[PDB]
Design a binder for this molecule. Structure first.
Ligand SMILES: [Mg+2]
Ligand SMILES: [Mg+2]
Ligand SMILES: [Zn+2]
Ligand SMILES: [Zn+2]
Lengths: 1362, 50, 49, 79, 49, 277, 99
RNA sequence: GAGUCU
DNA sequence: TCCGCGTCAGACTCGTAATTATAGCATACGTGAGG
DNA sequence: TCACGTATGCTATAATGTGGTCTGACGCGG
């Protein structure tokens, strides 16, 4: 059975007959009365085998007495019925028929190889026109179609001088006559003279095919089928329904059409009937064969009885319900069940409640095995009845098997690996599965009726894999982010919160206790509240420089309840950890601290004890939810009446015609959105510090113990957002569009919504629940694309010996630092020797892990940026080295050799997309954008440091910025960046570049709902290509008459002014242009679409004045749904509609000639004297002002970067950082934590292929894209031994294309495009040697990674040795 | 009879269940008073007033 | 369905994620006990034999 | 060993080569019927193998030593 | 969808420029459809079924 | 151009010479005598008749181009056996063949399990009876209402009506868009599952040991008779071919082997336990 | 619902689906990626062969486990054997070039 | 085709 | 610039089994039993 | 050599070109 690889080729007519064991010459199935295989029918016993095991039809030869005996009477071999799914058959077609997959599957294959259009071939097939096969005198050209009339011409004049024929016969003779060797040479030699792009593309693809056609051992003949193979009967079964009715496959129905028409064709050829009749029959034969192979492809698919079309062969291969995706990359499984899950808060974290009767049916074979060992049952049938009667002895043995025998629990959807976890089963009384509360976060499992799948790991390997890898206690940190997924929620947080928090005096304040146990004594004795401030003696162990723990005793001022919680705390943590009032965010840090200090065991026990005490003290608290607990501010009706009057003011100004519709829309939303903030801040201020209590002193105040407040403050469930809808104001609801409804709901759920408020609320309700049903599948399809590309990638090597890495500056974005350097750089090999500021002693070695210890030292010395070894920079050919990846984020230690990183990376990216599409959608009612970024206020004192900024001073005396991507830094005393902002175009700076500012100063100011166009020169305004009606429109008022001009774009524009660009030209007093200082550009600002202009023609202006105001309408609340397409586009490496232009070679610029507005750049570098020319559109205002030392990859046009242009000009590390930053920004907006290394994994797979420029010393030569890994393995032998060095360029690929580019065709046909993959592999004669995981999952082998890693490499040495 | 999780309310924003609970209690409070008056056997005019 | 005395307060995580804690008294009263009438047919057919 | 297999992983190294050694030793006690080094304490052959790895009695190298001992002793009774 | 005439328009689904191509559909209870529609170049066109 | 198979064949047969009265007789005169040109231009010309007959005989079993093909085959036998000597026309005579060749070939191919001529024409008798019974018994006719109209067996009317029941395909979905079909529910009863497979390995491995257990002459005679150890399942009288060569002593020793084995099953724990099985 | 061993489908030779049919659980490619990601390749191979299609594997393994011996004696899924014949019936030579 | 968990 | 083709998350529960129409009888063709 | 199910054969008024759903989208070639 065992084997090396699988190969695909075209089936020769000869080859088809080898598989066949007889010809099916009749369309009969079975006799209606004596139900048996018919004489040479589709279910023939003489051809495919006997229906019973070792029994002929007539019944002369029965059982193994007659082993290999073929009955002489009926003609049936006495063999297993197994032979009926294995033996195939054939049909000798009287006339050739084209194979649809080598005809319709574009590229046409038969047509691409003949260089003859598909249309032209089909005309020949359906007998519309003759094609010349070999015109004797070259009067008649080869592959020239002749109409029925034009055939009659040549027939009388020439006759035998030409051989033009019609039907599949003609295309087959046409494929027979063509010589691959002679035509291939000619195509090579005649490409020399022309050399264009699409000729050289198509002529080179024709050469590649012709050469691969020769080397594959395929003939072009075989594109047309003379013989048609038959599927074995058991694979297309005619079996009886329980009742007398029968059922059959749709293949039997398609085979019958083919055999009928083939047998009738033979009869009409026997009858020497006119050709008109014969042609109809040959068309019908082509139709039935084409329907059999791929039904719905050539024409409308042939329907059966049901009105639906008959399922063809191709259909059982292709796509989702095809063998690959449903019965091969995934399976139904023995020793499995499921049920409704329910809590087990008593359980330990390594345990789960498994019902009696479930576990009994699950572990049946192990019970029969124990029952024979103890001597209770003689045979299995006896043991079966003992278990079926559920005898008392059986429960005791079941109990024995299950101890120390783990079980796997799974939930849908399986988004990430933690969707399956192993537990020790606990037999329980009921029928419901009991799940441990702490693993509930990994499963996303609530108990409101979830169901979970049960699997038994049978084999010992599987028992050990379950316990060592997939056990719940081993899987604590998330592999996506190095943080614990096992974190208390709900009751547990509320309980520890209630315990730790203090209260004024209370019972027994300022007492003095011997220890944590006397604190539990006073609380249970009923003499102190858990909230009494008390001095207590507590002894904390803190860990020394060596492994030993140092003990320290001290009086601590904490509450009684805090002393009691210390009892749970293991020795090793300071007491400072339980001294604060604990919420969910703090409790997660406790187990993360404990994991890094103590280990795995302590955490698992600590996590449990936290769960136990958290639930129990939550229960003591008796925390509740009443209508009075939803406090409304007394001043709500005040805020609304003020805010109502403000909105009435803009609508009254709109009726006058002062403010426009779009302006009022953005302006009204800002008033209501700040009013919701005002009511909510009033609510939380009159809710949080509302408890005003009398102490034994006089009177003070503390945080309120309002039940709902505690629940949102602790973070147990709900948040301030939800409390708005409950007590404050419901807010702006979202349109189903995404755009925000102009009337928000003033009321809250305590007060109740009225008829209309509800009706408005339902718009947003339905649209959220709609995304939970629909948009989840765009997100889940990303998971799938990501997995198929990264699949094969595994840790192969320990250390690659590469020196390279990506430089990681800290993500300081938008005032507050969003992601420290520490977080981004943690658990990563230091690429280069990265020391302290004073370069006079190395601080960190080159090949060394970054432990939290070393990361803390980075903050001490203030390491700013650190070059870090990345997955992308690995020089491993085979997979990735352990060093380049670094620490397994799930394990907190160096990654093992053999672990599958590709899949882990895909899953981490895919999961939060997919699950967040269901989250704030069921939970979402409202909209909550606040995009009103009017002004940057700097918070620390600093010097203002602008970068990528070119401003110009205005009449007012204000530094106005005339650059799009201006950044604003905040430089401290020593000279390092603390805060960072985006200052936009046309913004007014308070202080210019280098000037000192104080803290809390408006350093920049601008208008958000408008993108002004600001001038760089002073003078008068000229109207150019601003013809009224063609390009712009006009509207006026009364008495005086103020008119505004509105620029139309290509949508609202006529065909008259399409090639007219509208622009506001600057001129002086005389009327001439005004040159922009220090440049030959006459001043001309191009106004885009929807641009409103209030200054009309002939108006005096200074520099810094706003010419036109482009509207900025974007009132969509950006959820996962609006940002995920961006992620998909990035991973798929799409150029945008307007790529920004970048300099290709470093050197001195000179601007050149022009094409009616369109610019040229004949740039001549200093070293490279040969020029590089490139065309530029008219409307692109350029950043560079020519004649300047420009380097590789300098922004010439402002605008979005193609990732292709980044990799092409600024290398791998540049494009990696573009993808990681752009993708990660989208998940950071949603608060999703994905390590950079996971994106880096997929980017590595995107940077798989590479195009070979210079000729090699193999058969790369030129134009052939090959994988990176392959060309380097050649270059290793070339650098040492010599011969022609192969120059290269690394190319970028999208996910969907990189997955299909893999040499494993079984990986490709299992992803998508099954019909195309199989045909291109069949014609090249490709051999898949089963490299990756997909391939071995398919064949049902051991994964060549993980535990099997060891095994697969051991087979690979058997192959090397001899 | 049943002990429900208060934390299954603020997230869900379905406050009607709490208004139902408060009023349902009030309604039973009337039932339990009439039950007590029928067990005590007070007066038809008294049941009429309450 | 049936109306009953409900208390809103946590309890040793037996009302963890909307998991519900019911008294034996509701099960004792057989009040949430449901009737399930079930229809199973026995068909004498005609086989070849 | 009972819940936690971290101590057994700290002794070999690789989570994967641990499962491979533990299974090899599990299979010896399962079929061959080898006697356990750690007290049984009434646990499955899987946990005995983990206990023995945790304590540093069973190892990839030790298992090859002991296989060569039993193998080569029988080879010497032949030769 | 009720039978009668209904006027509709692809906004910027039709074409690259974003020419709002206006259209009409006469929808009977039985019988063939009648479509009238513009093109980018503002020529009127008719299509049946 | 038109790339459809149907409207192309229809274009061809269109430009075909529509024959008159003694034009038919003139060609058919040389057709029966044997002519190349006559057979074709008679048949070529009369394809236009086949189409119309096949057009009405549709939506019943085959599609359409199928009826034309078998219809063209009936027109060819009409031309081979036409008699121009008779004064009667060809369009009259050929209409009998084209209606006939289509009717009789549809009966065979329309059905997946091949239904023969007798049983189909049997059935059509019962079907047309049903339509006339139905107009006067409002509700469809019972199989006894049909059998009692013809005074023929109820078994014979049930037999043939049972063969009318059509065949459902396995790839037909029960779900709708894409849930599960009938293969996804239907079991392969011929391949027994591991529990059933291991039970006859355990039943028959238990018996291979119970053979070595009973006496040497008792397990010889008992095994080789049933065909357990021997090659062929012999009888009490046929055990005499081997070494037994007895009729009384073979029957005493067969049952003596089974009686000692009955108490081996009473003690091991089966007997009445494995009697239900 | 729960199942150890039961009926098998006609062509695929995999377990049935649903409690209506007393069927096993669906191990989808989502669930495959989870054991792939861990490394547990034996757990996966178990579910891809002896619990699913592998006809020799399933009856053999059941016997190993009653004999006590928790041994992996695998093979090749019948669903792949089906894929071979379905691709060969398309007129595409797919053969197993061995070691 | 009507549902259940996401 | 327009037409064609290819993708479009993961498990579960239930539920049922549809329709039509082919004339009529005479010699020929194959297998199986009895004289 | 019949018995039995199965198949082949022929019918002469003339008759001679066929007839279910009407709505996706976003991308990416030729
Ligand atoms: Mg939940
Ligand atoms: Mg749920
Ligand atoms: Zn036979
Ligand atoms: Zn590396």
């Amino acid at each position: 059975e065992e084997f090396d690889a699988i190969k695909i080729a075209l089936a020769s007519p000869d080859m088809i007959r080898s598989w066949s064991f007889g010809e099916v010459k009749k369309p009969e199935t079975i006799n209606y009365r004596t139900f048996k295989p018919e004489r040479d029918g589709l279910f023939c016993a003489r051809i495919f085998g006997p229906v019973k095991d070792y029994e002929c039809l007539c019944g002369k030869y029965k059982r193994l007495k007659h082993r290999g005996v073929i009955c002489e009477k009926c003609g049936v071999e006495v063999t297993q019925t197994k032979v009926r799914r294995e033996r195939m058959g054939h049909i000798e077609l009287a006339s050739p028929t084209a194979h649809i997959w080598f005809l319709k599957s574009l590229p046409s294959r038969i047509g691409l190889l003949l260089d003859m259009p598909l249309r032209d071939i089909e005309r020949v097939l359906y007998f519309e026109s003759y094609v010349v096969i070999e015109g004797g005198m070259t009067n008649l050209e080869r592959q020239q179609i002749l109409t029925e009339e034009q055939y009659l011409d040549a027939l009388e004049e020439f006759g035998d001088e030409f051989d033009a024929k019609m039907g599949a016969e003609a295309i087959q003779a046409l494929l027979k006559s063509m010589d691959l060797e002679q035509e291939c040479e000619q195509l090579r030699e005649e490409l020399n003279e022309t050399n264009s792009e699409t000729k050289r593309k198509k002529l080179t693809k024709r050469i590649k095919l012709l050469e691969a056609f020769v080397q594959s051992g395929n003939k072009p003949e075989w594109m047309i089928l003379t013989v048609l193979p038959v599927l074995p009967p058991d694979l297309r079964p005619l079996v009886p329904l329980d009742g007398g009715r029968f059922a059959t496959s749709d293949l039997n129905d398609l085979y019958r059409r083919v055999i009928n028409r083939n047998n009738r064709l033979k009869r009409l050829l026997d009858l020497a009937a006119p050709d008109i009749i014969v042609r109809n029959e040959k068309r019908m034969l082509q139709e039935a064969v084409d329907a059999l192979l791929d039904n719905g492809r050539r024409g409308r698919a042939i329907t059966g009885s049901n009105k639906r079309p008959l399922k063809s062969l191709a259909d059982m291969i292709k796509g989702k319900q095809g063998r690959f995706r449903q019965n091969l990359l995934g399976k139904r499984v023995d020793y499995s069940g499921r049920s409704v899950i329910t809590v087990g808060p008593y359980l330990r974290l390594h345990q789960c409640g498994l019902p009696k009767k479930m576990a009994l049916e699950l572990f049946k074979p192990f019970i029969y095995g124990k029952l024979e060992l103890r001597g209770l049952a003689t045979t299995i049938k006896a043991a079966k009845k003992m278990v079926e009667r559920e005898e008392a002895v059986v429960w005791d043995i079941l109990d024995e098997v299950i101890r120390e025998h783990p079980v796997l629990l799974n939930r849908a959807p399986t988004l990430h690996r933690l969707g399956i976890q192993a537990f020790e089963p606990v037999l329980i009384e009921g029928k419901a599965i009991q799940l441990h509360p702490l693993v509930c976060a990994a499963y996303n499992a609530d108990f409101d009726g979830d169901q979970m799948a049960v699997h038994v790991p049978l084999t010992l390997e599987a028992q050990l894999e379950a316990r060592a890898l997939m056990m719940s206690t081993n899987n604590i940190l998330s592999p996506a982010n190095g943080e614990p997924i096992i974190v208390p929620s709900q009751d547990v947080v509320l309980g520890l919160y209630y315990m730790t928090r203090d209260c004024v005096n209370a019972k027994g304040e300022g007492m003095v206790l011997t220890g944590p146990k006397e604190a539990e004594r006073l609380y249970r004795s009923g003499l102190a509240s858990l909230h009494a401030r008390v001095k207590v003696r507590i002894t904390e162990y803190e860990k020394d420089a060596n492994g030993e723990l140092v003990a320290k005793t001290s009086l601590k001022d904490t509450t009684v309840g805090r002393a009691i919680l210390w009892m749970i705390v293991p020795k090793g943590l300071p007491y400072s950890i339980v001294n604060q009032a604990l919420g969910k965010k703090a409790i997660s840090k406790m187990l993360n601290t404990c994991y890094r200090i103590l280990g795995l065991k302590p955490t698992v026990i600590f996590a449990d004890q936290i769960m136990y005490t958290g639930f129990a003290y939550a229960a003591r608290s008796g925390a509740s939810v009443g209508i009075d607990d939803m406090v409304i501010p007394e001043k709500k009706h005040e805020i609304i009446s003020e805010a109502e009057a403000e909105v009435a003011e803009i609508q009254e100004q709109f009726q006058s015609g002062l403010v426009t519709a779009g302006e009022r829309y953005n302006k009204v939303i800002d008033i209501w959105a700040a009013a919701n903030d005002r009511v909510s801040k009033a609510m939380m201020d009159n809710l949080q510090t509302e408890t005003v209590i009398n102490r034994d002193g006089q009177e003070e105040k503390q945080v309120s113990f309002n039940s709902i407040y505690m629940m949102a403050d602790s973070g147990a469930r709900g948040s301030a957002a939800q409390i708005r809808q409950l007590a404050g104001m419901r807010g702006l609801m979202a349109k189903p569009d995404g755009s925000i409804i102009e009337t928000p709901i003033t009321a809250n759920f305590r007060e109740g919504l009225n008829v209309l408020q509800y009706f408005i609320s339902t718009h947003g309700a339905r649209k959220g629940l709609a995304d939970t049903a629909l948009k989840t599948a765009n997100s889940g399809y990303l998971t799938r694309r990501l997995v198929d590309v990264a699949q094969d990638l595994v840790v192969t090597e320990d250390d690659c010996g590469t020196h390279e890495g990506i430089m990681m500056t800290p993500v300081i974005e938008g005032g507050d630092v969003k992601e420290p350097l520490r977080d981004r750089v943690l658990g990563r090999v230091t690429a280069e020797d990265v020391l302290k500021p004073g370069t006079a002693d190395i601080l960190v070695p080159r090949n060394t892990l970054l432990h939290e210890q070393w990361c803390d030292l980075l903050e001490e010395n203030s390491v700013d940026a650190v070059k870090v070894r990345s997955v992308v920079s690995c020089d491993t050919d085979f997979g990735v080295c352990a060093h380049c990846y670094g620490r397994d984020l799930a394990r907190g230690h160096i990654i093992n050799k053999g672990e599958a990183i590709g899949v882990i990376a895909a899953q981490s990216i895919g999961e939060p997309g997919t699950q967040l599409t269901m989250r704030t959608f069921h939970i979402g009612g409202a909209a909550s954008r606040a995009a009103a970024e009017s002004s940057i206020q700097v918070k620390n004192k600093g010097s203002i440091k602008l970068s990528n900024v070119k401003s110009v001073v205005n009449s007012s005396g204000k530094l106005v910025i005339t650059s799009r991507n201006t950044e604003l830094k905040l430089i401290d005393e020593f000279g390092r960046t603390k805060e960072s902002y985006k200052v936009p175009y046309g913004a007014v700076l308070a202080k210019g570049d280098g000037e000192q500012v104080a803290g809390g100063e408006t350093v920049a100011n601008w208008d958000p709902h408008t993108m002004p166009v600001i001038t760089e020169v002073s003078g008068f305004v000229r109207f150019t290509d601003m013809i009224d009606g063609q390009t712009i429109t006009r509207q006026t008022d009364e008495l005086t008459g103020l008119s505004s001009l509105v620029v139309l774009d290509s949508a609202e524009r006529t065909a008259g002014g399409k090639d007219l660009r509208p622009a506001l030209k600057i001129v002086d007093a005389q009327g001439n242009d005004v040159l922009i200082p220090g440049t030959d550009m006459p001043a001309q600002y191009f106004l885009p679409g929807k641009a409103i202009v209030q200054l009309e023609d002939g108006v005096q202006i200074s520099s810094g004045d706003t010419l036109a105001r482009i509207p900025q309408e974007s009132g969509g609340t950006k959820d996962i749904t609006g940002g995920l397409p961006r992620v998909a586009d990035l991973f798929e490496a799409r150029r945008p509609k307007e790529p920004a232009i970048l300099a290709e070679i470093s050197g001195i610029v000179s601007f050149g000639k022009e094409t009616k507005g369109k610019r040229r750049l004949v740039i001549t570098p200093v070293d490279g004297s040969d020029p590089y020319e490139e065309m530029i559109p008219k409307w692109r205002q350029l950043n560079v002002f020519e004649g300047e030392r420009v380097e590789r990859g300098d922004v010439i046009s402002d605008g979005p970067e193609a990732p292709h242009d980044i990799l092409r000009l600024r290398g791998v590390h540049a494009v990696t950082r573009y993808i990681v930053n752009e993708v990660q920004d989208v998940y950071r907006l949603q608060g999703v934590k994905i390590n950079d290394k996971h994106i880096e994994v997929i980017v590595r797979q995107m940077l798989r292929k590479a195009t070979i420029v210079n000729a090699g010393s193999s058969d790369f030569l030129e134009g052939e894209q090959v994988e990176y890994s392959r060309v380097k393995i050649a270059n290793r032998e070339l650098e040492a031994n010599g011969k022609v060095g192969a120059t290269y360029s690394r190319d970028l690929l999208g996910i969907t294309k990189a997955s299909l580019a893999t040499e494993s065709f079984i990986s490709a046909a299992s992803f998508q495009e099954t019909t195309r993959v199989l045909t291109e592999a069949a014609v090249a004669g490709k051999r898949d040697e089963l490299r990756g995981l997909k391939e071995n999952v398919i064949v049902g082998r051991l994964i060549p990674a993980g535990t099997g890693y060891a095994y697969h490499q051991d087979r690979m040495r058997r192959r090397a040795a001899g | 009879d049943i002990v429900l999780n208060p934390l299954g309310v603020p997230s869900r924003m379905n406050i009607g269940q709490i208004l139902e609970t408060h009023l349902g209690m009030a309604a039973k409070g009337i039932g339990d008073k009439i039950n007590a008056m029928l067990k005590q056997q007070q007066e038809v005019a008294k049941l009429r007033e309450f | 369905g049936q109306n009953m005395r409900v208390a809103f307060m946590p309890w040793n995580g037996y009302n963890f994620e909307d998991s519900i804690l019911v008294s034996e008294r509701v099960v004792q009263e057989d009040r949430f006990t449901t009737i399930h009438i079930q229809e199973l047919a026995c068909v004498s057919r005609d086989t070849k034999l | 060993a009972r819940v936690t297999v971290q101590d057994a992983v700290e002794k070999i190294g690789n989570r994967f080569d641990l499962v491979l050694v533990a299974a090899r030793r599990a299979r010896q006690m399962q079929v061959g019927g080898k006697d356990p080094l750690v007290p049984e304490e009434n646990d499955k052959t899987t946990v005995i193998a983990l206990r023995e790895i945790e304590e540093g009695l069973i190892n990839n190298q030790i298992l090859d030593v002991r296989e060569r001992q039993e193998q080569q002793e029988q080879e010497a009774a032949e030769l | 969808r009720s039978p009668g005439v209904f006027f509709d328009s692809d906004k910027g689904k039709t074409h690259s420029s974003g020419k709002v191509l206006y259209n009409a559909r006469i929808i009977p209870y039985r019988g063939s459809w009648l479509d009238f529609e513009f093109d980018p170049k503002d020529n009127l066109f008719v299509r049946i079924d | 151009r038109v790339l459809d198979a149907t409207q192309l064949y229809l274009g061809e047969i269109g430009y075909s010479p529509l024959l008159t009265a003694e034009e038919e007789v003139y060609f058919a005169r040389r057709a029966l005598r044997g002519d190349v040109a006559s057979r074709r231009r008679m048949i070529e010309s009369n394809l236009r008749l086949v189409v119309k007959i096949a057009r009405r005989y549709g939506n019943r079993g085959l599609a359409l181009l199928d009826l034309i093909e078998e219809g063209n085959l009936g027109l060819i036998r009409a031309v081979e056996k036409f008699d121009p000597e008779r004064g009667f026309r060809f369009s009259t005579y050929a209409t009998w063949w084209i209606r006939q060749t289509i009717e009789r070939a549809i009966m065979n191919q329309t059905r997946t399990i091949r239904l023969p001529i007798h049983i189909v024409k049997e059935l059509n008798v019962y079907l047309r009876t049903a339509r006339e019974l139905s107009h006067k018994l409002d509700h469809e006719p019972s199989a006894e209402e049909i059998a009692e109209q013809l005074d023929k067996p109820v078994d014979d009317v049930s037999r043939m009506l049972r063969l009318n029941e059509r065949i459902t395909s396995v790839d037909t979905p029960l779900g709708g868009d894409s849930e599960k079909a009938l293969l996804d529910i239907l079991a392969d009863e011929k391949e027994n599952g591991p529990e059933d497979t291991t039970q006859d390995d355990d039943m028959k491995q238990s018996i291979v040991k119970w053979l070595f257990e009973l006496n040497a002459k008792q397990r010889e005679v008992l095994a080789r008779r049933f065909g357990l150890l021997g090659y062929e399942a012999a009888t009490l009288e046929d055990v005499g071919r081997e070494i037994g060569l007895t009729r009384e002593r073979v029957r005493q020793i067969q049952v003596e082997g089974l009686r000692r084995l009955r108490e081996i099953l009473q003690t091991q724990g089966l007997n009445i336990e494995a009697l239900f099985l | 619902h729960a199942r150890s061993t039961g009926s098998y489908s006609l062509v695929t030779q995999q377990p049935l689906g649903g409690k209506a049919q007393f069927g096993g659980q669906r191990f989808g490619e989502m669930e495959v990626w989870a054991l792939e990601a861990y490394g547990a390749a034996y757990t996966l191979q178990e579910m891809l062969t002896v619990k699913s299609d592998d006809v020799n594997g399933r009856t053999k393994m059941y016997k190993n486990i009653v004999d006590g011996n928790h041994q992996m004696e695998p093979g090749m899924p019948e669903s792949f054997n089906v894929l071979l014949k379905e691709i060969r019936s398309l007129g595409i030579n797919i053969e197993l070039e061995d070691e």
